[model samples]
Target chain A: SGFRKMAFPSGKVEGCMVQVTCGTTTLNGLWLDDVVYCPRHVICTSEDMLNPNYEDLLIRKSNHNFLVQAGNVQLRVIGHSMQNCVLKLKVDTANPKTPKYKFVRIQPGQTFSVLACYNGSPSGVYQCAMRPNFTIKGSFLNGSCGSVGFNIDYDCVSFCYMHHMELPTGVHAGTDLEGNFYGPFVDRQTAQAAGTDTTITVNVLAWLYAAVINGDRWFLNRFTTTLNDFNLVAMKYNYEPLTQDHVDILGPLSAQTGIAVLDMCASLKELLQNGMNGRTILGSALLEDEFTPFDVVRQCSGVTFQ
Target chain B: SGFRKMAFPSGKVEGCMVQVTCGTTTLNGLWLDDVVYCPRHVICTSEDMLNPNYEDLLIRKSNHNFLVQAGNVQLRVIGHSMQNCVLKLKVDTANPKTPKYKFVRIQPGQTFSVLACYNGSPSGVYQCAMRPNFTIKGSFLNGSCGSVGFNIDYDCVSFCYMHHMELPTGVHAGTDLEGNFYGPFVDRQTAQAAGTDTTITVNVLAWLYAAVINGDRWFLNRFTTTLNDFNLVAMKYNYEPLTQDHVDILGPLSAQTGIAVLDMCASLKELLQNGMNGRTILGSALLEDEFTPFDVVRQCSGVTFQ
Candidate 1:
């Protein structure tokens, strides 16, 4: 039979980030669309509510007051072990142009409303926040984490909350493209604890900047090489280490390229941490030396080798 | 709130190499669980069959005759535009050792009855084949395009007609864990042209071997390195290729040391084949070189930094 073509559609996006409460801790380089892995938060909506759209609940703007109607707002407390929690609502009308926020304690199970009040009298973008009346057992500071910082043309803003800061889980909040969110807190303790700390800090930093300036290039280069070498050596010599000759040729080069050396050391440390012997590193390192010369020659000469 | 760990169920194997007949074409992969993939000529029966607890159709050990009456066999044929075609069954017991098969063709509305003849004995694997007897406008090969192959693993497969002869889609048939078999036939042409090369070849090899052996390793490596440079690379990157400097430093003393060089060439070739510009290659290559002293010292050492 002749060949035929088949097409399969990609899977759909499961959920989105609807709301984010700033943490007390502050990260320098957090940004929109930066992925948040293992974020410290509990997003809860009425289980009876069918198809509650998460995107609608996400915090839309930074440094703004949002309103939530009595039952419409879903509460997501970001922190470790939130048992009993109290809800606080505040309004800042200090500047008629832009109203700030203050803490107003709500009665238990009391239905309160809030609106994200911005600087403009007309009230720019608005969202809702749900505050639970129960006291939480776990403190946000105890489990507070940090996030990648957001950059608005390279400017950083500080927000506060009690949770491990991470990139916003899903896409929303004026991000035109699919991106990530990083930080919303300044102090780790304040981030972890429910108490508020006000300060300015950058949220998410661009990955490219982090890669170029943070000595990540060397670290990554060496890491990948070590991994590759490990595989090759494992497959060939039953996971042995590098020989004296291998070390002699490549050790100095690796050391001179501090990042690569550090990466190799880091890989070794990881191996040791994982309960593997240093012999594997030595073997992989040796294999790397052999394979590296050819690539180096080709790269320098810009000539292809068969 | 304190941290709550999410748990995922551990997957376990139930059965290997189960055969399932396609009563109709366009079967979904979701029907089978724990199946890595299947090949042509091999029918896959899920541990959970569409109709669970169906009796196992037994084959006699001695004779090759089918003991169960032909009328009891319930089989459905599915393909493109052949929704209404009916199937008939026949057996060739002439050679007791190796039994052959034939089918009685029936029309959609025709009433067909199976005549039970007491066969002497039944033995060996009782194989059945289907034949289209009814007169139709289109032949089986013409109307229903052709059979489709699925990768059960990555949810990828190919579909075409019997006229085309190209590599089967999905992974290599050799890599498929399950074997292949002739599925249902379609009546594409009129009843006059009943049978065509509707026969399918069943060839089952290893599943996912091609993907493991020849997928885009270089690009994956580069991506891994980029991620790891910031120390944000996931644990999965450990299997990716190494940087040139890593190769230089770790290659010589290890077995299988040539793999790094091979991986570099593979990456370069892939770039060239993908129509990447030389400038793009040079730029990325230079950045990669920065991670290693091999290239810098080998070629740039000759050129004075004026």
Candidate 2:
């Protein structure tokens, strides 16, 4: 099989590369043959250098440098013939329009679950009808790679929407369509009565700051049931670092918890705003997205936890 | 300040870089001035590109490639007329002789806490005398970077001596100088009585294979007191993946636990032998060296755990 190059954002460092099986051949073989290559830099220097199994070249958030950044990227099929082949693109974007990049075959009359980011925030998704020249090139595609012959689509939501704020496990905290901040709620009723009862609102934020973010597993496990059981139907989503707008409101609340919180969350929000790598503290799955390297991320930007 | 270059093993990828404060200026300031530099490739692509806080050019185990491998590296001071300055080289080798790299100023007639490795195995350390020409060039040094004016030294123990086998919390097991394998013992006496009672010996290895390596925290916690309370007279050290000698003995023992053990431990040993990245399973700190990127290391080589 003759290989074709897939385009990707320049300079961005690749975090992890996993190879998946496509038909009888593996993506590793496809990449080796140059049948399909995505990012320019090929850093497969691990033990699986020769024959790889899972090859999804993902650029995790922590290593998204300023020079080598991919705020958004797009992909689709092209280049005539091979009509029988079906392509599956696993787009794990920080875009809300297509919150989860659903798997679909890229063919004539097919719709794409497109997601795009603008400036730095996720913007929207755009739908386009596949052309007669469309053809499946390969099986593996990541969050930030593009294919030839497809016009870029744009349908996205804010980065805040796709990346939910890090709340206590099971606690519902996210942004609305209007970009309004909502409850870091314990229960649905507290969230419903959010406006009337400011005390309850402050308490939840304090717990998040003092316990959750601080890596006090014992204290966090105490509220595990109440926190896990309570959820807002409209607001369930994944987590990212706190946005600047979130820091603006919650920073003050975080500091209000205690003098320790003032020292802790204040420094934390400062790091978050400054784009410090998020790390899981103690055992809490707080900062850092799922794709980020666990041990590397654990090395830097962690709090003092027992 | 003319920057003197430090030599390091080629091809091993750099993991985390941290800069520390040095007297009047920061290590970052020194590196910028070319006062001191270590390793060949300079990968400073993070947010702290210009101004870095900590600069320890460490090559963590997970990223240690075959080509760029550094089993051991040496460092000491050279050149004349900078006697007032004190150099601190932080050597973190897997070698057992100098188990922990200690902070010391390389000056006239000083003894070095040296560590070395052989054929990918930790060997021993060599103490050298510092001559009058010895002078401080920089404050920062890592596991494998070497300075000029130093002869390579070697003094080490078996890899097993440094990296203790992973036992249930509080359980103790290690090797003797004669290279005989001992208990994954629950108590000191049971370890002493190892040959007399085969039952207690096999029981501990089974627990380590099943509960510890299998990531059964509940079962692990149950034996926590018995395991933690038991301690040998002279065997206390950090953890590493089991050696082939260990796997040869413990592998069959691991299979004796259950059908699941045969599958799990069998797969794990193959990965370890072939140098797959070690992952911290569930919450247990089992595989991978300490300097490895936690999240990055965690992303691969982990077993399915509840």
Candidate 3:
């Protein structure tokens, strides 16, 4: 009838120095303890920081400079073997402009000689998280004496928690804009035949010219193929500008003169549509009519089909 | 002054092996004498092996393999470390098939291995050369219990050297008599665009059939492009074959049909050339006249005015 009671021995805490020995080497176990638990998990927040939210972080910026900072904290490393360990920072976000970060290697058993910038506005947040290189053990000592316990839980919750949000849109806005306005389609034959170095630059110039002068999207679509072919032709001739004679020979046939050829084609289509019994004029006829122009008003005005 | 007479001391020969001990290990030195030196050299020949001039060799029926023999040849190797050495064999003479050769890795301080093969018949030259893996000072006793006195000559020549002749024309012939070749150019699009896995196989079969039956190179060329575009089109339709109605709605235009479309274009060209003439009659009256047909025909029939 008496309440049964049993006493169990509690786990021991051998001090704040949680030294983990694997085989013969003593690893700084505080780094592990600081990371493994849920509330104490280390997180990165800035685009420049290594452990930042990869989806949200802008790897590149238009300003051409990347800023990364760790909060002010005291860190101690020990052992001669730690000399080869490095502290690398990475930014693999979707943004094309972000520059990657790589920090210097830390020597073993060296105390934190330099302190990072820290802001204490958000209470108990160390202001930033620091990650050691490939070897996982790094230690942080709170500025407290007489065996005061360090609250890693509060530090993690205040600073290291990443906000889960959708990745920033328009990360590839420039590329997308170029593809939409200029083209997604390219002539495979022309691109393949072009000489190695000049192909991309020449094609880009052709696309730019078409986008600038011929403001018609329908014409632009056809112009893309023609421009690609014309560039290939130019590449074949060593990228020389077409002379008047050369233009006379190919200008009527090629898409090189851009909208003029399109206009000629359109007019020929109109002529055949009205006067020629609604017979669809062939491409060769249109090309031939484009080359040799006659008074269409006189030939077509009095036309009456049987 | 009396004529000076100089006496030369014979080369030293020590038979003893002595060890010098340091702390935990000992180093040993061994010596020998009466060595004959055979300097290194390469051999080349002028007789054509493929079409050998048997008349110069003074031998009838000269189809025979060559022979190489090594006898009484001594090679010395010396080193404290384990020697890593390789011996390469090459046949200077050519055969229809690949020439025979072997490579052997030899252990340090090993005695010479004999290489014996049949020699060239009818007085053709054969050669065997040897060099030590490492430097050694040792001597070999020649027959008759005397030191072998040999000259140190880096260059050596063997009589009746031969050369490899060029292959005769018309010796080898290819099996492909009909040039209905599949590639040189492949249609990657069609292969990927196929409906089921069987579609690609069918396309390949169709390609071979078209090549064999029609002997049309144009089809083969377009086939490649079609196949390449097939994958893209297939991906659009989720890998289903296009039905006849689907083809009717979405099929290629006249210009899109490639070279076949050029034929129909010729008809349009003839109509345009004749219709543009000012003297031609118009309306039902022009259509009714019997002679008008011939006139129109004459005007259109390959008529060109310069």
Candidate 4:
């Protein structure tokens, strides 16, 4: 509560670099413990070898896009395809990308498991090499088809993997964790060999979205706030792009904070259609909106939005 | 290498305390980064939130005893019975316990969720003191006979809730992680209440084994060698009490080490029934001809085996 100004030993403080040399300081020591989201000691894992049967089970076989979360134990996914396939992972499931100039040819029988990691994590955050200097975990899951179905395990490290450079498939999750042997949900896609590049991209992204994001609300929220932050500025009130009023009234998130959020219009719709069965209690926000293919495509292709 | 010893400058080694101090011995002063598995800096959580989710979704319905593991994110289960009922939880899956000493009564249409925690975790583990010196994540997932059923969600903190405490219900997982939950394949028994005091004690002990020793081979291994060492001192390989040779063959582990482990018999039988589906990769040693209910029950009741 008191203010004091003192002359430095060098009288001229303009260019001085300083550190205190007192016998004691307020802090017990330099503690970096406050960095909570760190990926340092954290591992994208499925099981603790010390407790092998204790798998964070990696069975994803039904949906196109299932979200993998970060935790002390971290999230580990199991993707098993009837055939070999390439899964190009991304941060924001809101916006879609080609995801592959290269391929992740997982063996037909092998379970492809990769530990998830992100920037700000010990492994450090996403880098510029992901192209256009991608960062964060907010995008949709993308996949590639050969003849039939394919499955691969994932982590945020899954989102971080690119089709360009080679990342380990069936990789070790941690010093010890589970092996992704089951299916998160088998990813099936119709033949797209003669299909246009757009068809292929859309085909894969859709499959991933189904298995990865479908039916999971918490994951979608993460995309909206973290990875999708950069694009929130242009969202419309409904399914269209922003109107002048939309920009005038709601653009401050980007204008003042330089962060954009993924619009929830597209996602909320899907949850409403058949979000639940006979009886339950999941409240209205999640069970309100229903998604159309048109909406998913539109949301995933947000770069084109003005 | 030659052996050498030193005496303190003070002439007595007992009073010497050493810490590196140079120009400034702030931090980086005693950096010990290699000590992993440290619960010291861990919170056992996924995200440190400035705000909590509206709970993206809550999906739990059909399963006899789907156990939730202890996690940074606590458990929030929904237990709605067609009528009122009691459910017990446990730490290991093989050895069982009452775990029912306290009845987690569920009202019709009510959701049940409890946070789980343990000792020596990234957050430094739990201590015994919530009455009766509580320890272990071992109990039962009981039910009441009715016309229908219910569902629940859990995390490690969920299991640790006191028999005397009340925690939260219906919570959210991360924005993007698999909510792929299934039965933990619980093994339950009829009420052994009013039976012999031995049976009641054995019943509680059994439940503990179910949650604590079921899947943790590492822990079970420790148990076999440690508790087996004691039992080895008392019985023979033919499943009888130990002879002096058996005692001579064992008795050193606990005397030299502090952590004791459970025997492997009950778990081995379960592992053999299906036999890893014949697609062998895990070791046979882990596949040891193992423990028995007799041994497990007796060892668990040990006030001190060493």
* Model 3 misplaced stretches (Cα beyond 4 Å): A1-306, B1-306
Interface RMSD computed for candidate 2 is what? Answer: 24.6
Candidate 3 lDDT tens digits, A7-43? 0000011111122222222222212222101100012
lDDT, candidate 4, B37-72, per-residue tens: 111001111231212121221122222222232212
| TM-score per candidate, chains pooled | 0.18, 0.19, 0.13, 0.16
What's every prediction's RMSD, in angstroms? 26.3, 28.4, 36.0, 30.4
TM-score of chain A of each: 0.20, 0.17, 0.15, 0.15
Docking class of 3: incorrect
Q: B269-289 in candidate 1: lDDT tens per residue? A: 343245222232211221121
Please, what are the lDDT tens digits per residue for candidate 4 over residues A1-306?
000010001101001111111111100000011111111111112222123221132232222232332222222223222111122122222211111111232321112112111210110011111111121111111110000111112111122221111112111111101112122211121111211101111221232242232233342333332223322421321222323333333233323333232233233333233333322222212121122222233222211100
A230-294 per-residue lDDT for model 1 (tens digits) = 44533343333333333444443454444343344345334333432212221121112111322
The candidates, ranked best first by DockQ, are: 1, 2, 4, 3
The 10-residue segment of model 2 chain A with minimum total lDDT is A1-10
TM-score for chain B considered on its own, for each of the candidates: 0.17, 0.17, 0.11, 0.15
Candidate 3 C-alpha error for residue A200, in Å: 4.5
Q: Rank the candidates by lDDT, best first.
A: 2, 1, 4, 3
Residue A116, candidate 1: C-alpha displacement in angstroms: 26
Model 4 has fnat of 0.00
Tens digits of per-residue lDDT for model 2 on B163-245? 11222222222222122333322211222322221112222233344334333423222112122222220022212223344
| C-alpha local distance difference test of each model | 0.20, 0.23, 0.19, 0.19
For model 1 the TM-score comes to: 0.18
